[PDB]
Amino acid sequence: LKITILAVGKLKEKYWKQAIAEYEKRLGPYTKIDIIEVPDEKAPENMSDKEIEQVKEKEGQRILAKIKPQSTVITLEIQGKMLSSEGLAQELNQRMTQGQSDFVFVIGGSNGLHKDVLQRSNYALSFSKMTFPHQMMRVVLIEQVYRAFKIMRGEAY
């Protein structure tokens, strides 16, 4: 029913923007798909832990302001549950079955997600043990959402 990608920062790369548009169109038919960006908190690149946390907290409070309290919140965390593609199809399916229709997948900025955003999570999803830049993570995520729908639908892909 509703699929939201709530991410930090914009995409300034045209190839990433073109890729997201492709998947957005492929997902259309299966679900409403929405992409919401919240501004990243502009800061130096070298920072104390103190400053790191302040940047996360500003980003996090804007992420949290966008999340309705009834939403199924899925946070992308390298330390979360590592689902196979079928494991994600099974996970989303089961939720839809049991009444959930509003899914918000969150992607943090360059310094990750604040613990507040992490405590709101309904499910921590890991895509890898490696670090993927947040702009490329957005492409990888939406392709993966399109894949899970195909799998939930028993469609070849």
| Cβ neighbours around 147 below 10 Å, total | 17
- The candidate with the shortest Cα–Cα distance to 36, out of 4, 59, 78, is 4
What CA–CA distance (Å, rounded) separates 154 from 86?
11
* 67: containing domain: 1-157
Q: Total structural domains in the chain?
A: 1
What CA–CA distance (Å, rounded) separates 6 from 117?
12
Q: Check the annotation: does 141 bind a ligand.
A: no
Q: What is the CATH number of the domain that holds 27?
A: 3.40.1280.10
What are the residue ranges of helices labelled H in the chain?
Answer: 14-27, 49-66, 85-97, 115-120, 134-152
- Experimental technique used to determine this entry: X-ray
Which residues are 4's β-sheet partners? 34, 104
Cβ–Cβ under 8 Å, residues 104 and 75: no
Q: Check the annotation: does 32 bind a ligand.
A: no
What CA–CA distance (Å, rounded) separates 47 from 45?
6
Q: Which three-class secondary structure state does DSSP give residue 114?
A: coil
Entry resolution (Å): 2.3
Q: What is the DSSP string of 63-91?
A: HHHHS-TTSEEEEEEEEEEE--HHHHHHH
Q: Check the annotation: does 97 bind a ligand.
A: no
Buried b / exposed e over 86-120, threshold 16 CB at 10 Å, is eebbebbeebeeeebeebbbbbbbbbbbbeebbeb
Q: Check the annotation: does 108 bind a ligand.
A: yes
Cβ–Cβ under 8 Å, residues 118 and 148: no
Q: Check the annotation: does 75 bind a ligand.
A: no
